[PDB]
């Protein structure tokens, strides 16, 4: 993960190829395809050793990533609806799981 300024312990994971995500109904799939660019393609997290397990890492990674993406989005005069946050939560959760596995693999590799 990359560190800069004042992340207060947080690190920025590398950009991930955006996955094709299906949300289970016609309206949401389309909405997502059209809006997915508005959600993060990388996540913020504290070092993996600072959490009890995956779930706690993921829960946190999701909250900070979304919180901090929301302020940058707010700064640009844009807003997230309940659908946006639901969808963002989901894709950020996926990336946070991937990040955990990558981080925990490195944590195992000395």
């Amino acid at each position, epitope marked *: 993960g990359a560190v800069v300024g004042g992340l207060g312990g947080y690190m920025l994971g590398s950009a991930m190829s955006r996955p094709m995500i*299906h949300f289970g*109904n016609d309206w949401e799939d389309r909405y997502y395809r059209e809006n997915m660019y508005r959600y993060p393609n990388q996540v913020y997290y504290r070092p993996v050793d600072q959490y009890s397990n995956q779930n706690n890492f993921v829960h946190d990674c999701v909250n900070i990533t979304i919180k901090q993406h929301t302020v940058t989005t707010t700064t640009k005069g844009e807003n997230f609806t309940e659908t946006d946050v639901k969808m963002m939560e989901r894709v950020v959760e996926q990336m946070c799981v991937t990040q955990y596995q990558k981080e925990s693999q490195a944590y195992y590799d000395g």
Partner: antibody
Amino acid sequence: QVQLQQSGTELVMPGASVKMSCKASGYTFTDYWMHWVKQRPGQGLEWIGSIDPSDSYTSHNEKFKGKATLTVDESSSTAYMQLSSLTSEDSAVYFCSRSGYGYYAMEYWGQGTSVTVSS
Amino acid sequence: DIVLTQSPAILSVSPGERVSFSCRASQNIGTSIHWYQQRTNESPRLIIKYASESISGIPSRFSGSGSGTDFTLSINSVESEDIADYYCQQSNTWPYTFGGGTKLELKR
């Protein structure tokens, strides 16, 4: 050819839980949503909930949130639905089904699991 | 939620006859309606998807039409094997909902 294999019957005590399986084959398991549908004797179809096997993201009929827990096992291409605190209201056939790729007609159906709750 | 109302509840039909039955949604769902056939003691079977799109292996006598709220499933020439309950379902938005069903019945 795709198949969804479900156990035929479950006999379960009032207040107990049951976990029923839906084993998929003949396609890439994580590419398609799985769905669970309830049918009471002589009544219509009721959607319980659905799951994306890729990340186990779910959606529920509000009435079944807290009643029906949906999971998958990717290794075995199997979807599960656990129903808790069963009553005679839960006596029904429960179908699993699979939709298309980014399309949500229920293209394939299991044979359904018939649940009888009785002491 | 999107309420799907199917009419009639029961339809008496004579073999060979062309029959139709309707599914109407309480809100616009574009073409996001799907029709299932359920014979007695069997699982439902998809017979038309997205209002009008045919399904492989399903007899060509089955067709669907409609877009928006009013949807119609038609059977060009009804056969004994078509005697079943027919359900519509919408997949436009959560929750998925089903119509209450149309039961086909042989007229005698």
